Design a protein around this ligand. Structure first.
Ligand SMILES: [Mg+2]
Lengths: 324, 337
């Protein structure tokens, strides 16, 4: 992924911003005098393999010149991993930090105000509609979904604060689905969710009250439904459930819950505009429709969900900008 | 778990109130002239056992007098099971339905105002404290929120006597917790899940704040189940397949504790947010979810206390699962008086 942008290279430095999250690392960088912003994401399971990516970026995109490279660490792990970064990059020009929430908002404000065709709405009926934000904006909520959910309130440029988030985020969904279905990739989980029918494992309004009917009353609610002396308890231990239906059920459960909490926070704070960031939606139409419908449903259309083409890079983008 | 209460028995109709949820049926009745309220719960899964309990109640506590028994059904299942009740009780005096929300609030208000030793607070530091709501000394009682947790989560706001309405609830309730843990861990009963949760350590599957930020407190949960995908064309999955793949990589008590915290913290947060929106300080929990389980009650209480900086308070009920059946019972008692 790349964006054309006339960057300022007055410091003659290769700036490399890294958002160090709980599960994923996101980098934003620009080869000097290239006027291209580049974006990359890695799954930092083994910290060794994440340092090795940074080395490869410096080698491939700055001629291996550590002395002309400045690293900006952001994300939740920025202050934590600062010393380790210095241990791993002794020849670096410098390493600085940028606080997580300020990184997110500076990066989001940059994408809203500077980058065209970056903000969009999505639902299954109207499709994707690009919002010409870089051509009303404030106040807004940013719901940043990754390792847990962070929710930030922005009333005007450079004025933001944290409101209550949630531990039921992308890591919960991927962790549950990985363990239950054995899926190894987010794309396998989302492909299954797209085809699945949650009604085989969810209790719907119709299932409680008998024959909106398709509204979910209890996510996964259909599943639970001295010494040995009788037959083994293998009848219930052997009940089987469809992987696509499980994926759709838990994608709905997690996304609808995020959307509700986001709605309630926007209601408390008198906010109409809700941006979703982080690596959660992945541009997937089912996930986006679910989050957008949740906001529309609870507000009867008086609040609006917005998505971002570079949703996963908000924090690293803000950190990149803080360098120069 | 009976209660003494001086009832007027009217024309001596034996009122049998049933709250039928997604998985449980809750029954309230009073033998004629006994001045005792009696309570029983049974799963609805096996219909013959559910109906057999109601027959046993009539035979043992109303001398087998079907002709003077009135069944009043409430809860979501009151519609789905109406024909079953008609089929199973052909000699009965009558069968009626009572609206779900009205049942819950009429029952809760009765317990709050009339029944001693019924409302209590609990957390790990303070222990259990009984609240004397039924004694002398409205501005302390109303307004309040009822968070009724069964398969899903229903949330009702009560501003004053007879003034109540529904607000946004949640599909992540007890059915979600039970469904996930029974599939993943093979727990046989809700009580076994709770015992396993009591023993577990969620830090082996959850990402804590300290995991991400180093040194919200460090021990707070940042990502429920967040260590699992990190450390991790078949159509069907089962417990056996999950178990045969996981292979003790993640321990069942740790999984139970993590998801108990995740579901409970989430319910507490949504309750807090609805109470914030509606400027309510008193939050009652109803249903079959807390079950007097200290860890669950502490978790819910801490969530409300945390987000509100101490200004809101979680309340629990000794007869939490019976609110709707109690409301229905009171309506039928009024009709037969
Ligand atoms: Mg610094």
């Amino acid at each position: 992924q790349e964006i054309s942008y006339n960057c300022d290279y007055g410091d003659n430095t290769f700036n490399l911003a890294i958002d160090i999250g709980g599960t994923l690392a996101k980098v934003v960088f620009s080869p000097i005098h290239s006027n291209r912003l580049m974006f990359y994401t890695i799954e930092t399971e083994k910290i060794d393999k994440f340092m090795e990516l940074l080395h490869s970026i410096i080698k491939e995109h700055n001629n291996g010149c550590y002395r002309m490279t400045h690293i900006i660490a952001t994300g939740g792990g920025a202050f934590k991993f600062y010393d380790l970064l210095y241990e791993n990059f002794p020849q670096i020009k410098g390493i600085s930090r940028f606080e997580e929430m300020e990184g997110l908002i500076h990066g989001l404000d940059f994408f809203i105000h500077e980058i065209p065709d970056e903000v969009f709405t999505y639902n299954d009926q109207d499709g994707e509609r690009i919002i010409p934000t870089s051509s009303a904006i404030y106040p807004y909520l940013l719901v940043n979904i990754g390792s847990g959910v962070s929710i930030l309130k922005v009333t005007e440029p450079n004025n933001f604060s944290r409101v209550g988030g949630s531990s039921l985020g992308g890591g919960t969904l991927w962790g549950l689905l990985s363990l239950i279905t054995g899926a190894q990739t987010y794309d396998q989980m989302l492909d299954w969710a797209q085809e699945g029918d949650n009604s085989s494992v969810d209790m719907l309004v119709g299932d409680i009250y008998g024959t909106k009917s398709s509204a979910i009353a209890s996510s996964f609610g259909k599943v639970f439904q001295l010494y040995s002396s009788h037959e083994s308890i293998e009848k219930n231990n052997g009940q089987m459930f469809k992987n696509p239906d499980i994926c759709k059920s838990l994608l709905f459960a997690i996304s609808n819950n995020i959307g509700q909490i986001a709605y309630l926070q926007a209601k408390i704070n008198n906010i109409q505009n809700i941006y979703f960031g982080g690596s959660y939606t992945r541009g997937h139409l089912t996930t986006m429709n679910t989050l957008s419908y949740a906001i529309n449903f609870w507000s009867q259309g008086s609040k609006q969900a917005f998505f971002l083409k570079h949703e996963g890079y908000l924090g690293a983008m803000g950190a990149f900008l803080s360098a120069s």
